[PDB]
Amino acid sequence: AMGSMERASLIQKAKLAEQAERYEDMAAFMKGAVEKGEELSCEERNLLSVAYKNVVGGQRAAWRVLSSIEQKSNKGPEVREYREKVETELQGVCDTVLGLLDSHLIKEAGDAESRVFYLKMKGDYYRYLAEVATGDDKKRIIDSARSAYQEAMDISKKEMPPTNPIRLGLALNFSVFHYEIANSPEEAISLAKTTFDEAMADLHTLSEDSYKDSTLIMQLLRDNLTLWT
Amino acid sequence: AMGSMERASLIQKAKLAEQAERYEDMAAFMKGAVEKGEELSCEERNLLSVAYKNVVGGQRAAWRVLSSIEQKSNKGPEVREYREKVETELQGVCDTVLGLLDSHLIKEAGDAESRVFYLKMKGDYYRYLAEVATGDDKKRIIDSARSAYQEAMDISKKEMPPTNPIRLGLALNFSVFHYEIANSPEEAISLAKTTFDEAMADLHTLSEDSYKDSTLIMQLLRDNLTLWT
Numbered sequence A, B: 001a002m003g004s005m006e007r008a009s010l011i012q013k014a015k016l017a018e019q020a021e022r023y024e025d026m027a028a029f030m031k032g033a034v035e036k037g038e039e040l041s042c043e044e045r046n047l048l049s050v051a052y053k054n055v056v057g058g059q060r061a062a063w064r065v066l067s068s069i070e071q072k073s074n075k076g077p078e079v080r081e082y083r084e085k086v087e088t089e090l091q092g093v094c095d096t097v098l099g100l101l102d103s104h105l106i107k108e109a110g111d112a113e114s115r116v117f118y119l120k121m122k123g124d125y126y127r128y129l130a131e132v133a134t135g136d137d138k139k140r141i142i143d144s145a146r147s148a149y150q151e152a153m154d155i156s157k158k159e160m161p162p163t164n165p166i167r168l169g170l171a172l173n174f175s176v177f178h179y180e181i182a183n184s185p186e187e188a189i190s191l192a193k194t195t196f197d198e199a200m201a202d203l204h205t206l207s208e209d210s211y212k213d214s215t216l217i218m219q220l221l222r223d224n225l226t227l228w229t
Ligand SMILES: COc1ccc(OC)c(NC(=O)COc2ccccc2P(=O)(O)O)c1
Pocket: A053, A054, A056, A057, A058, A060, A061, A064, A124, A172, A173, A176, A220
């Protein structure tokens, strides 16, 4: 439904929807913009990520509440039916994002900052699919997340400095994937520790604003390490 | 889309959606339940009010942000177009609620607690329509809100004690209608003061739990009076 709206107008409206905290609208404007077929700039990539993170984040929090209620009830079919409806809507949002990345954001992304950003996003949305998946397509979804994260880590370690915020946020989310999804808490702790230590040694190269950006994400790595150890 | 679901299952799902903070779902479940055609109980009336208050409250806050941005811009048509889209969606939610009340909740409501609750709701949703209305259908929408509120106040003063929470909340919202919509700050202050004073004189008749319920709303009346005087 956005094919008749100018790209620039979709971007402008996504920024208005963010101000208004209208995240489903923001995602629909940014999906529209991606579907224009042009590569996205840094600012536009961040608008796309912020919109979908907030939409799926609402769905994941609801699914958690419902899942907890369902597990306590284990009445009639209602809790299961409504948890299933929220789960399906979550899956649909993840499949939309994964489809934007496959058609055709990743294949057109040649620069490291864009290619790492989109492969981190692919890891993240398969990770949200894994949180609700049961059994053995669960395995295949977990390996798709791990593969995306690993491709992004390999490019990031060749092409970005250790304090780059996209590299830091990738490592943060890959560490969370290992602790919460892959049942690999030692890998999670090793990754978050190595990432933190390599960033700290590179901080001296930064300006004051870059230092603020990097140390913000380093504090997230530290906060997980405190929770995990 | 809820015609195939049991009434009891719609109520149960509205309570689950409230726990999950899924207010659009909660409203759609309660609309479904109303459309079964049976009168609603006290608890069910409160579920209907909580769902729509949260849905329209999100829309009103977004419309405020957008309207402020638009008034500052007075670029191209985008801010106006997106404010109009949020305004239209707000109007649609209000028209849905008003339609449930007209078809046929109010006409079947014979007891004072139900009839006052639904006429307060009718006042409230015409009040939200008035906040976004421009000119002379604006006048007619303001008079519809005032008429509904006045009918509810007349029943409430005949049939409920001055500390009844529905009577208090009606008077609170009618006072806000006079201050913010009707440009009648003196009427607003007179109503909120008379209501507060008549409730205070009736508190001695209450149990401890009823006293907690009434004094909570009295504090809201006091908070407005502090803001207005
Ligand atoms: C509204 O946004 C929501 C909603 C629900 C949520 O949990 C349900 C979360 N998650 C968090 O708050 C913390 O997650 C972290 C922490 C560090 C790195 C990556 C992540 P994530 O798992 O990609 O979000 C966010």
